[PDB]
């Protein structure tokens, strides 16, 4: 080998060896990730080096948590990572389609066919499939029912059915709460907080915020009914001079005077807060809650607690925006000009204690544009799994809202695209018809894997579904209970249009790029 001739300690795989290595890696990934597809898939349990336990079903999480050191596996992992980052779904389908595309290409490549013709056929088939996907999508006004159906089709695949049913309501309600008219949805306005005391079905939606910290002074009220919210980012603790001043005195009395006078700067701001609290509410019915992004020294805590003010310190940076949107106040970086107009309102604030941790609830807001989901469960891995599931559901609902089109699921669109590609195949000149056929067969993997995971056999279920679609023309998928063809649109099995488009584009691009690779080199040492 030439590369070995220059660098003796270099590993090279040339031409057919390179193709075999790539196809083997893709096939191994495909056989591992086959069982993830569908709600009837099998949970995978993942133990890290430190012994942490991870139960999950996501394709991306699984790929990240497998102990693999393969280049093609790394490329597919990057593709799935991009898929998850943008759309949040389809990673398992991504890996399955990439592997099946590579296998179908190899079927014809082993017969002496050059991969370039296969890639050209793949390009033509991808264009035709994209046209068909544009043709087949269903434009619907996204009411609550359709969003609930989409969230179910995601969560049921990602989590237990009953927990999925709870998470559907939670996710859809949160999304509808934070969404404004014709304005892009900011998912940062939904806080996903984890508590580890109750059961997994106790996860719910709070129309407000939950903070993982509470008041640091024991005398502060644990529960205030009607509260004014003061969201601020002003330090209330002692701060050094930037110029390294230090003090000089000649007697104990002078030292006492300097000690008393050195707190005046902080005391002025505490006095401003206290004066505003006195002005806004002169009775004990109303309450005052101070949430500060900066720390508060014990002296200011005592001064505030003497005035019946609940003060939370060291809040999260994003919590400033979340409180501003939910409570309705104004986040202040200084107290130079503070007015009652900048105060938010909360209909109930209380502190909940859980072991060593301490939590604060802010609910009963007027019209909260930012809400929080309280993930509850008995185990850490349960919380992680629920967090991944709710992330997937939020992404799916946001994608469905973004474009008013939704695509029927259960593999119906895959079968329809396969038949359309087969019909279009004669229109393709040259030997690219083989590539088009390979692309169609690769697209047919989703119903195959769904039927295989559901317990039925691939051939009979696939031919039944294909015959039904051909004779009727409807979009018929896979019934995971009976195995018979079924109209996914009528039963509520929906899939994101953007997810399908990204799947087609990314899978075709990565498969074409891998097919044309004829040499793997490691000569950087």
């Amino acid at each position: 080998a030439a590369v070995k001739t220059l660098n003796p300690k270099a590993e090279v795989a040339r031409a057919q060896a390179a193709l075999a290595v790539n196809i083997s890696a893709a096939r191994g990934l495909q056989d591992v990730l086959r069982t993830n597809l569908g709600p009837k898939g099998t949970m995978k349990m993942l133990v890290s080096g430190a012994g942490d336990i991870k139960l999950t079903k996501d394709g991306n999480v699984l790929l990240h948590e497998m102990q693999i050191q393969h280049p093609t596996a790394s490329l597919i992992a990057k593709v799935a990572t991009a898929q998850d980052d943008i759309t949040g779904d389809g990673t398992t389908s991504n890996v399955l389609i990439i592997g099946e595309l590579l296998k179908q290409a190899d079927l014809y490549i082993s017969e002496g066919l050059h991969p370039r013709i296969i890639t050209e056929g793949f390009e033509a088939a991808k264009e035709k499939a994209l046209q068909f996907l544009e043709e087949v999508k269903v434009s619907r006004e996204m009411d609550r029912e359709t969003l609930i159906d989409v969230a179910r089709t995601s969560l049921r695949t990602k989590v237990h059915a009953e927990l999925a049913d709870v998470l559907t309501e939670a996710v859809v309600d949160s999304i509808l709460a934070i969404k404004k008219q014709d304005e892009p949805i900011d998912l940062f306005m939904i806080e996903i907080m984890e508590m580890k005391h109750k059961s997994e079905t106790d996860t719910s939606l709070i129309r407000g915020l939950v903070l993982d910290h509470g008041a640091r002074h024991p005398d502060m009220k644990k529960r205030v009914e009607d509260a004014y919210i003061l969201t601020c980012n002003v330090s209330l603790e002692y701060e050094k001079t930037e110029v390294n001043s230090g003090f000089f005195y000649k007697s104990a009395e002078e030292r006492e005077k300097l000690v008393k006078a050195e707190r005046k700067f902080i005391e002025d701001r505490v006095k401003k807060i206290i004066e505003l609290k006195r002005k806004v509410c002169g009775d004990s019915d109303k309450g005052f809650v101070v949430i500060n992004q900066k720390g508060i020294d014990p002296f200011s805590l005592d001064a505030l607690s003497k005035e019946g003010i609940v003060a939370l310190r060291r809040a999260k940076r994003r919590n400033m925006e979340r409180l501003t949107l939910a409570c309705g106040g104004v986040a202040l970086n200084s107290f130079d000009d503070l007015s009652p107009d900048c105060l938010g309102h909360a209909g109930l604030v209380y502190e909940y204690t859980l072991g060593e941790e301490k939590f604060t609830f802010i609910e009963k807001c007027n019209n909260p544009r930012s809400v929080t989901l309280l993930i509850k469960g008995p185990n850490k891995h349960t919380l992680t799994q629920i967090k991944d599931a709710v992330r997937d559901g939020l992404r799916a609902v946001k994608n469905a809202i973004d474009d008013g089109c939704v695509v029927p699921g259960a593999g119906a669109v895959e079968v329809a695209m396969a038949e359309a590609l087969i019909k279009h195949k004669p229109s393709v000149k040259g030997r690219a018809q083989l590539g088009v056929q390979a692309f169609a067969d690769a697209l047919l993997i989703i119903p195959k894997v769904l039927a295989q995971n559901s317990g039925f056999d691939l051939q009979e279920t696939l031919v039944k579904i294909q015959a039904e679609h051909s004779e009727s023309g409807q979009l018929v998928g896979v019934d995971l209970n009976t195995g018979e063809p079924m109209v996914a649109a009528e039963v509520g099995v929906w899939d994101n249009y953007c997810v399908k488009k990204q799947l087609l584009h990314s899978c075709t691009v990565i498969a074409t790029n891998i097919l044309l690779v004829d040499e793997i080199m490691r000569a950087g040492m």
Partner: protein, 526 residues
């Protein structure tokens, strides 16, 4: 005792003679053979494993060559010339290596035939001069005002890459970026795509969504949530100095002996921040971009005037913004003037892509800098697309600087080879044989194109040479796809004259340099 005595230090190896020349030429040949199959529109791709753990799925010759480690110094020289060709013109990296390998291959025949290398070098230099003359002769002019011709040139430059599937979009992006970057101040023409044509790769989406913005895009967000994220016609002020209260350069110590001095010092810190912010506000801007931190009190004072602020920005991004919106970076806001205020940006929008916030200053009128937003399958695909876009932009700038074109697909190689062969018939000395040898060695480009196309090399090369022996056949090459001879006046494959000249010069001078070498000495430490 009595350790051995000797003249040179230990581990000081030395080789000399015909063995050294044979080894050098073999190393050059093997380097050429490493990337021989990565030439032409039907070139296969390669997967380079970065020792850091990354993967480089690339077709560019220089990208492949610079990712490998070699021990033979001749291979090091080959890598260096590949890098030189890449930097000088932008493309042609995998052609100059092949040409140099072939020239050394045909020189080895004469070095084995009792011919001193100096005669071969003289013949090579004469051949290079005549190659340059012939290339300048068969060139054709191009009017840069024609958009279609420029797009065709860029396409012919990118048919051999992985971006040829989206060739129209890639050509439009490259041409727009190069034209937008073009600038001239104080009577000095300048096309600086390295600093002002920025390529930003964001994985995801589809490659058809990639475009070139009339502005600058950065991975930034507003410091405070209440600050505006959408402004129609912003007035931009750029700063490269902190808006905070920092210590002075000279050592300074305060001595507090009075009660009210500590609070007075803190109040003066606040007042200094307020005065700085008021100096900023006096120009009435809409957004403020700083390369250094902005204090929270400064944020509040700016927000009081309804001003958006981006906290920390790299120097290059700030320079790009200044070019795009016509601003001027200043350091002391008390000296801020109306001229430094950046007007010209037509929209500043801070939208969310995936799970990250990105700041757009697009919709500028007459911007001198741009960002090429690339969206694709993954990081490696985007990296390859960026490499292809770099090649396209380099070719576009080469054409803009030199509007001369020469036929591609080996037509220029065959024409120059035939011209050299015809000229050599007047030669009578011993120098003619290496002259003709390098003349026909220049034919390695069409041979490599035919080999990569899969067609039969011998009969196609014979027919092409016979065609080039005719009178008006200087533009006859080979199809990289169908493997058939075709006139390039009708195929449309043309490459810049500067690229071809640089490739030929680099190949010939590399051959000269490696032929001037004997008596390799190694082992001495620094």
């Amino acid at each position: 005792g009595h350790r051995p005595v000797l003249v040179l230090s230990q581990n000081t190896k030395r080789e000399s003679g015909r063995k050294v020349q044979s080894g050098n030429i073999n190393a050059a040949k093997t380097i050429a053979d490493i990337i021989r199959t990565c030439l032409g529109p039907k070139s296969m791709m390669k997967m380079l494993l970065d020792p850091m753990g990354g993967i480089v799925m690339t077709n560019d010759g220089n990208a492949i060559l610079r990712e490998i480690q070699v021990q033979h110094p001749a291979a090091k020289s080959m890598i260096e010339i590949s890098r030189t060709q890449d930097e000088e013109v932008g493309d042609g990296t995998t052609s100059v290596i092949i040409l140099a390998g072939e020239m050394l291959s045909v020189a080895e025949h004469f070095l084995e035939q009792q011919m001193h290398p100096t005669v071969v070098i003289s013949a090579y230099r004469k051949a290079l001069d005549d190659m340059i003359s012939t290339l300048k002769k068969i060139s054709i002019p191009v009017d840069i005002s024609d958009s279609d011709m420029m797009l065709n040139i860029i396409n012919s430059s990118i048919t051999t890459k992985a971006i040829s599937r989206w060739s129209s979009l890639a050509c439009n992006i490259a041409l727009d970026a190069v034209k937008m970057v073009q600038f001239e101040e104080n009577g000095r023409k300048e096309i600086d795509i390295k600093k002002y044509a920025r390529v930003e790769k964001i994985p995801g989406g589809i490659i058809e969504d990639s475009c070139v913005l009339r502005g600058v895009m950065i991975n930034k967000d507003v410091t405070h949530p209440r600050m505006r994220r959408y402004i129609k016609n912003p007035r931009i002020v750029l700063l490269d100095s902190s808006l905070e209260y920092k210590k002075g350069e000279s050592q300074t110590d305060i001595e507090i002996t009075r009660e009210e001095d500590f609070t007075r010092i803190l109040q003066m810190e606040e007042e200094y921040i307020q005065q700085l912010c008021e100096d900023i506000i006096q120009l009435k801007p809409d957004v403020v971009i700083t390369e250094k931190g902005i204090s929270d009190l400064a944020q509040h004072y700016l927000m009081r005037a309804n001003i958006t602020a981006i906290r920390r920005v790299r120097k290059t991004d700030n320079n790009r913004i200044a070019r795009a919106c016509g601003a001027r970076i200043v350091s002391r806001p008390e000296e801020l003037r109306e001229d430094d205020v950046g007007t010209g940006a037509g929209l500043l929008e801070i939208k969310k892509i995936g799970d990250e916030y990105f700041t757009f200053i697009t919709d500028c009128k007459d911007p001198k800098a741009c960002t090429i937003l690339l969206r694709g399958a993954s990081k490696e695909i985007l990296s390859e697309v960026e490499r292809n876009l770099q090649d396209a932009m380099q070719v576009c700038r080469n054409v803009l600087l030199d509007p001369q074109l020469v036929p591609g697909g080996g037509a220029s190689e065959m024409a120059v080879a035939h011209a050299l062969t015809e000229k050599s018939k007047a030669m009578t000395g011993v120098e003619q044989w290496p002259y003709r040898a390098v003349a026909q060695a220049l034919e390695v480009i069409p041979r490599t194109l035919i080999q990569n196309c899969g067609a039969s090399t011998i009969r196609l090369l014979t027919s092409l040479r016979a065609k080039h022996t005719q009178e008006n056949c200087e533009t006859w090459g080979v199809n990289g796809e169908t493997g058939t001879l075709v006139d390039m006046k009708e195929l449309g494959i043309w490459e810049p004259l500067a690229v071809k000249l640089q490739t030929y010069k680099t190949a010939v001078e590399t051959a000269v340099l490696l032929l001037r070498i004997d008596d390799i000495v190694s082992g001495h430490k620094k």
